Amino acid sequence: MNINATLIGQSVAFFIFVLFCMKFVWPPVIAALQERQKKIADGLDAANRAAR
Amino acid sequence: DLELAHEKAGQQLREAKAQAAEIVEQAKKRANQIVDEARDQARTEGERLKAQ
């Protein structure tokens, strides 16, 4: 169908969005998952420390 | 459970030191009995020997 510069506006918005989400969407959630990981791991190690 | 186990262990750990020390307390009473009966035995050998 018809070829337009429409791809530019969407691509430019996407490049800026990809750089933004890496700093404001992934870090808070991955940190909140790493905390639970650490809490489950150290919580299971706490039982091994008590048993020793 | 780690803190509760540390408390359970803390009580069993110290109670065994007091109970083990009581074996030494029986040994001190036994040592006194050995020495007191040795003094009576020595007195007995002294009065038995001088009679001859």
CA nearest neighbour of A47 among B4, B32, B15, B37: B4
CA–CA dist A36, A44 (Å, integer): 12
Q: Do A47 and B6 touch (CB under 8 A)?
A: no
How wide is the angle at C-alpha B27 spanned by C-alphas B24 and B29, nearest 5°? 115
Cα Rg, chain A, nearest whole Å: 22
CA–CA dist A11, A8 (Å, integer): 5
Using an 8 Å CB-CB cutoff, list chain A residues near B5. 50-51
Cβ-Cβ pairs closer than 8 A, A with B, add up to 10
CA–CA dist B46, B29 (Å, integer): 25
Q: Where are the alpha helices (DSSP H) in chain A?
A: 6-24, 26-51
- Look up tokens 């510069």; give the residue: A5
Secondary structure (3-state) at A25: coil
Is residue B5 within 8 Å of residue A50, measured between CB atoms? yes
- DSSP class of residue A3 equals -
Obtained via which technique?
cryo-EM
Q: What share of chain B is helix, strand, coil (3-state, %, to 5)?
A: 95, 0, 5
- Look up tokens 């307390």; give the residue: B25
- DSSP class of residue A5 equals T
CA B4 to chain centre: 34
CA–CA dist B1, A49 (Å, integer): 11
Q: How many helices (H) and strands (E) does chain B have?
A: 1, 0
Q: Output the six-digit token pair for B43.
A: 């007195």
Q: Do A46 and B2 touch (CB under 8 A)?
A: yes
Using an 8 Å CB-CB cutoff, list chain A residues near B2. 46-47, 49-50
**Residue of chain B with shortest Cα separation from A44:** B2
CA–CA dist B1, B7 (Å, integer): 10
